[PDB]
Design a protein around this ligand. Structure first.
Ligand SMILES: *[C@@H]1O[C@H](CO)[C@@H](O)[C@H](O)[C@H]1NC(C)=O
Lengths: 215, 197, 217, 221, 216
């Protein structure tokens, strides 16, 4: 129906990581298959695991597949630099609509340097902007390694979805990563709520900055 | 691998499927003795495509797929690439690039009974031809005319399946034949089914 | 040997027609389903739908049903992807792909991909807004460079006298098709009421220059 | 790829003959052997097929129980034994292998691509039978003749009026009846005015049976 | 079972002839491949056409085969001396309780080396002598024809009779034309119980019928 993977995983050269994959249905009445794909930037996905466990020729060992009920799992053993890519879960069911589904995707980072936690700066809309009948909350994120973050916004306490523009991480000169996330609101929305919140997730660690309309 | 491929399970099944609802048996991780097949004085038909019966025991494959069913004698010729007819169109279609062997044997003494054996069915009507290895088991009333059927049999509104009615006194072209299609798959991957090394 | 060759990269505008192609060699083209996959920038893979070119039979994903057309041409071994009116949200990389075998259903064969970039907006100069500092120690102030097209912008501080502590973030490409960008500078707190901080935004394509002073709250 | 058959056979009726056929090249595309027979001046008749790998044999309804076909997978040789021989078993016996350019192996659509040179089998009875001779009366000129009926073996010689009559004589080549016996006709064209004034005798000799007939052919009344 | 070919076909050098092969729904009609064979005088048959229309290597371009319904057909264009032979069609048959491979009767193909000559027919009824010996033969004598291929049909009144007929393969006379003969065996009681008997001779699409009666 929909296959869920973790947004990102990471390890250093030599370590073993495991990407999970959840929400796989099946039909014994027709054919089925669970596959894993690996995609390097700007390139077509390469099949890494077919038929749940089976591995093509030319695809290294180290990679192995498995399944538990509704959860598939990929394990890259003895991580190498060339392993840094996006990995996709995939299911086929001949009698499903759709037949083919790709998973949500996982970025694998192979740490070339020590892990570095992000610094988050949150800016409210300027009163100068509120005069122009617009409002933008600016959330700037810098000095993180490796370059993988999720940014979720919160109004009062419950999440916002619409009016959220977020950049993809980009390497700084120091080799850590920078990203930004903008939340658009009406000055009406801004002034009415108690506070808005920018929440950054990096390496299973969460940083939450909050700004309030009344100052 | 010492594992011997379970050909017995397929060829000696006792119960065989109607053509429209043809069975598939995956064959993996064993050594295949094709000798057991081509040495048997049962098989009136042994057509191999992109491969040779002699060559079989000296060949390696990723997987093998055994499809089995029953048909009329005259229909044995249709279980082949680039054929047409009620069976190749509506029941069981091989692709143009098919790699494998089609093996058939007369089963009059098993699948025929006096008064006719009406158990084995085939699809007589379809809106379109099957794609290769497609298997249609639905029993939607077929609209032959201009009137919608609404799932009711009647004039120009036919049940899509027909009985063969194999009786033992028929000519061979109307006698039952058991058919096993062996598909030989060859992926850029290690082979799991090989002949005696 | 099986190969899928797709047409070159396309750069279009909202409202235009587009037909991208995928030509297959090395196998019986009419005997196998072909699938289209969409990848929006920085996002995941989506299965669009399949066509059987020997027949032109199609199955669409519920998502793409009625928003794209998949077509075939037996004779030239080509399979197409067709739009009437491109949205900006159609910006993506598109892949044609094929099963491994008649028996292995996993997409082992892939095209190289065709990049489709739909530009929506015309040349517009940005608005610039001050990001005021709060309150020994440092304070962060900056400039919001909002809604411009196309790239790039030039941000400097105090006509370029200030460079250390400066961080101009790469620009978000918004759904409206317009670009936004931020520039922060980190300064001592004992400066806020002394040193004036002005950011100099320059948009060469538009020919617009904005100087915005950033004052303590 | 050669098919080499064993030499010609001369047998007596009620006897047995085992003809041979060896392949030369390989089994790499030789899966079935069929036997096809041809009686002198006649068509071809499929007799049987053997599947070389399995030794399963299938025979024509006509010879069921009188023929067995065996093969020797080691020598690539197939055999055809015909028991309880009859006169009408006299024929050329051809072996041939099944072929089809669509698949490797055997099927119903197999054409005979390579043929043996052939084995002529002659079922010879050293018997004799003398002809019965009958007058073919006439109704310008008139045709009259002799019917020479049911003799064996060849030949008979025919003359008219001890050889005094040569003009307009046609002795037809004999017919081989399915009974194994021969029948022959000799006709002569003579003047109508000479009928009932010229006596017409035809002289049939059949040396094999030591029979001579001088047959008087007179106009009917 | 048999497939139905014409017994004889003729053509002059350079011409095009066809040979038809007729079967039933147990053979051609079922969809079984039809194979053609060429047998030169004193030689073994040669595969000429396999699978309806396909030619083996070393078979001239001018031979071609086609199949349609219950019928097959062989076509020879620009025929020459080398083409004079017997031609057999062959398929599979599924009527009986066992596998059955089935040939046509064969077609004699004459390359015309000489102008056509129509046959002379003489029909003799049974003699009294033969009737007294409690037998009866009708004698049909055919001569001076070319090409050397003829077919004979016997009739009792209107009705054809196929039983008790023996016919010769034609053979060259000294004049280079051909002679043949055909005999019909009857019981004296059969002879007496029809109004007449006919010998009907067909040669190159033309027919001579001579008739004899008991009561004359
Ligand atoms: C089926 O049984 C027969 C006789 O018992 C045997 O020869 C054959 O090997 C069996 N089938 C297979 C292919 O195992």
């Amino acid at each position: 129906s929909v296959l869920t993977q973790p947004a990102s995983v990471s390890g250093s050269p030599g370590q073993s990581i495991t990407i999970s994959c959840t929400g796989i249905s099946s039909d014994v009445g027709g054919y089925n298959s669970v596959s894993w794909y690996q995609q390097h930037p700007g390139k077509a996905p390469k099949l890494m695991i077919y038929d749940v466990t089976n591995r093509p020729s030319g695809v290294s060992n180290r990679f192995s597949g498995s399944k538990s009920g509704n959860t598939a799992s990929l394990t890259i053993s003895g991580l190498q630099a060339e392993d840094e890519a996006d990995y996709y879960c995939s299911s086929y069911t001949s009698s499903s609509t759709p037949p083919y589904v790709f998973g949500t995707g996982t970025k694998v980072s192979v740490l070339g340097q020590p892990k570095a936690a992000p610094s988050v700066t949150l800016f409210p809309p300027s009163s100068e902007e509120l005069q122009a009948n617009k409002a933008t909350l600016v959330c700037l994120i810098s000095d993180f390694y490796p370059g993988a973050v999720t940014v979720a916004w919160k109004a009062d306490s419950s999440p916002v979805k619409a009016g959220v523009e977020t950049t993809t991480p980009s390497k700084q000169s120091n080799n850590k990563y920078a990203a930004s996330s903008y939340l658009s609101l009406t000055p009406e929305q801004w002034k009415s709520h108690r506070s808005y919140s920018c929440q950054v997730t990096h390496e299973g660690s969460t940083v939450e900055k909050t700004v309030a309309p009344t100052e | 691998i010492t594992n011997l491929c379970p050909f017995g399970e397929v060829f000696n099944a006792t119960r065989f499927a109607s053509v429209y609802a043809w069975n598939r048996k995956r064959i993996s991780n064993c050594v295949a003795d094709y000798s057991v097949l081509y040495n048997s004085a049962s098989f009136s038909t042994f057509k191999c495509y992109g491969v040779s019966p002699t060559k079989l025991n000296d060949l390696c494959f990723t997987n093998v797929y055994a499809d089995s069913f029953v048909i009329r004698g005259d229909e044995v010729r249709q279980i082949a690439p680039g054929q047409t007819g009620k069976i190749a169109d509506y029941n069981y279609k091989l692709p143009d690039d098919f790699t494998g062997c089609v093996i058939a044997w007369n089963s009059n003494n098993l699948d025929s009974k006096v008064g006719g054996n009406y158990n084995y069915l085939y699809r007589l009507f379809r809106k379109s031809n099957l794609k290769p290895f497609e298997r249609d088991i639905s029993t939607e009333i077929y609209q032959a005319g201009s009137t919608p059927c609404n799932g009711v049999e009647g004039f120009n509104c036919y049940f899509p399946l027909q009985s063969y009615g194999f009786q033992p006194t028929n000519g061979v072209g109307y006698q039952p034949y058991r058919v096993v299609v062996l598909s030989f798959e060859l992926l850029h991957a290690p082979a799991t089914v090989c002949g005696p090394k | 040997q099986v190969r899928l060759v797709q047409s070159g990269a396309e750069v279009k505008k909202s409202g235009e027609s587009l037909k991208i192609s995928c030509k297959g060699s090395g196998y019986s083209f009419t005997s196998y389903w072909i699938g289209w996959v969409r990848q929006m920038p920085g996002k995941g893979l989506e299965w669009m739908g399949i066509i059987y070119p020997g027949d032109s039979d199609t199955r669409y994903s519920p998502s793409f049903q009625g928003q794209v057309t998949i077509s075939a041409d037996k004779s030239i071994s080509t399979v197409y992807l067709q739009w009437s009116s491109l949205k900006a949200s159609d910006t993506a990389m598109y892949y044609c792909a094929r099963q491994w075998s008649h028996y292995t259903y996993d997409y082992y064969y892939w095209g190289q991909g065709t990049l489709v970039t739909i530009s929506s907006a015309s040349t517009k100069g940005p608005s610039v807004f001050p990001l005021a500092p709060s309150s020994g120690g440092t304070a962060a102030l900056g400039c919001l460079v909002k809604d411009y097209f196309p790239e790039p912008v030039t941000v400097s501080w105090n006509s370029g006298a200030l460079t250390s502590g400066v961080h101009t973030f790469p620009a978000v490409l918004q759904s409206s098709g317009l670009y936004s960008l931020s520039s922060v500078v980190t300064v001592p707190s004992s400066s806020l009421g002394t040193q004036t901080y002005i950011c100099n935004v320059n948009h060469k394509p538009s020919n617009t220059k904005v100087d915005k002073k950033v004052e303590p709250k | 790829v050669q098919l080499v058959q064993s030499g010609a056979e001369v047998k007596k009726p009620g006897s047995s003959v085992k003809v041979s056929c060896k392949a030369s090249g390989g089994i790499f595309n030789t899966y079935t052997i069929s036997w096809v027979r041809q009686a002198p001046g006649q068509g071809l008749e499929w007799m049987g097929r053997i599947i070389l790998m399995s030794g399963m044999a299938n025979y024509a309804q006509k010879i069921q129980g009188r023929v067995t076909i065996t093969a020797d997978k080691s020598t690539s040789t197939a055999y055809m034994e015909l028991t309880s021989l009859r006169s009408d078993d006299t024929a050329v016996y051809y072996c041939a292998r099944g072929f089809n350019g669509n698949y490797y192996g055997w099927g119903d659509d197999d054409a005979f691509d390579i043929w043996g040179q052939g084995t002529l089998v002659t079922v010879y009875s050293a018997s004799t039978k003398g002809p019965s001779v009958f007058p073919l009366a006439p109704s310008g000129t008139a045709a009259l003749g002799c019917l020479v009926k049911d003799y064996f073996p060849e030949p008979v010689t025919v003359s008219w009026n001890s050889g005094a009559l040569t003009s307009g004589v046609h002795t037809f080549p004999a017919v081989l009846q399915s009974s194994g016996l021969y029948s022959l006709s000799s006709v002569v064209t003579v003047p109508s005015s000479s009928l009932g004034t010229q006596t017409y005798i035809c002289n049939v000799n059949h040396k094999p049976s030591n029979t001579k007939v001088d047959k008087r052919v007179e106009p009917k009344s």
